[PDB]
Write a protein that holds these residues in place. Sequence first.
Motif, mmCIF file in Angstrom:
data_model
loop_
_atom_site.group_PDB
_atom_site.id
_atom_site.type_symbol
_atom_site.label_atom_id
_atom_site.label_comp_id
_atom_site.label_asym_id
_atom_site.label_seq_id
_atom_site.Cartn_x
_atom_site.Cartn_y
_atom_site.Cartn_z
ATOM 1 N N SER A 1 -23.796 76.123 19.943
ATOM 2 C CA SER A 1 -22.519 76.446 19.276
ATOM 3 C C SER A 1 -22.635 77.715 18.453
ATOM 4 N N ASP B 1 -17.129 68.519 19.030
ATOM 5 C CA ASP B 1 -17.877 68.505 17.786
ATOM 6 C C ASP B 1 -19.142 67.640 17.908
ATOM 7 N N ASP C 1 -17.196 72.238 18.236
ATOM 8 C CA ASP C 1 -16.837 72.746 19.565
ATOM 9 C C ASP C 1 -18.064 73.298 20.284
ATOM 10 N N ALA C 2 -19.076 72.445 20.418
ATOM 11 C CA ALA C 2 -20.311 72.821 21.097
ATOM 12 C C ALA C 2 -20.186 72.703 22.616
ATOM 13 N N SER D 1 -19.580 84.331 23.271
ATOM 14 C CA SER D 1 -20.112 82.984 23.488
ATOM 15 C C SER D 1 -20.495 82.777 24.962
#
Length: 182
Positions: free
Chosen positions: A154, A119, A100-101, A4
């Motif tokens: 995300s 979120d 959870d961006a 990520s």
Amino acid sequence: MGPSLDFALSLLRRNIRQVQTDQGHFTMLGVRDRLAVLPRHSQPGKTIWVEHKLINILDAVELVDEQGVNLELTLVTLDTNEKFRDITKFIPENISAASDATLVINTEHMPSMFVPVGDVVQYGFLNLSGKPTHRTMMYNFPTKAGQCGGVVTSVGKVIGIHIGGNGRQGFCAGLKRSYFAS
């Protein structure tokens, strides 16, 4: 490095640019070829400052939905040698909620900035400083001025462009892949 972090940093390096218009400092997302997207509030003119030089804009399209309602996104075709790494595969086909961006901002004032917005939920209608807007999404994070254009991401997906906030929450225009079809 993890997946990520690698994805966000590569997006920053290859696709997310610091820009200035007559309305001030914004983040711009380059999507493919010479096609980029801006928040509508940036009101790009015939030229736009991109990183370190002035770039002519060949075409601009302010997107509206089938009712004629503002979506708060402007597509621009740039007269540049840069060709953007094609990220359309990472944009969903429909406007998608996410867990959870991260919001990635990149302006001269807020360079390479990572904001943990949490979120992202479907929101829909938003009255943006007097302008009605459809297809928005919402995060329960108190975003601030100067983050318009920031990219919501995300798990390898590029899902929205930041368009404003109310002091407790932030909102994005949702992205869908068809906006960028040729």
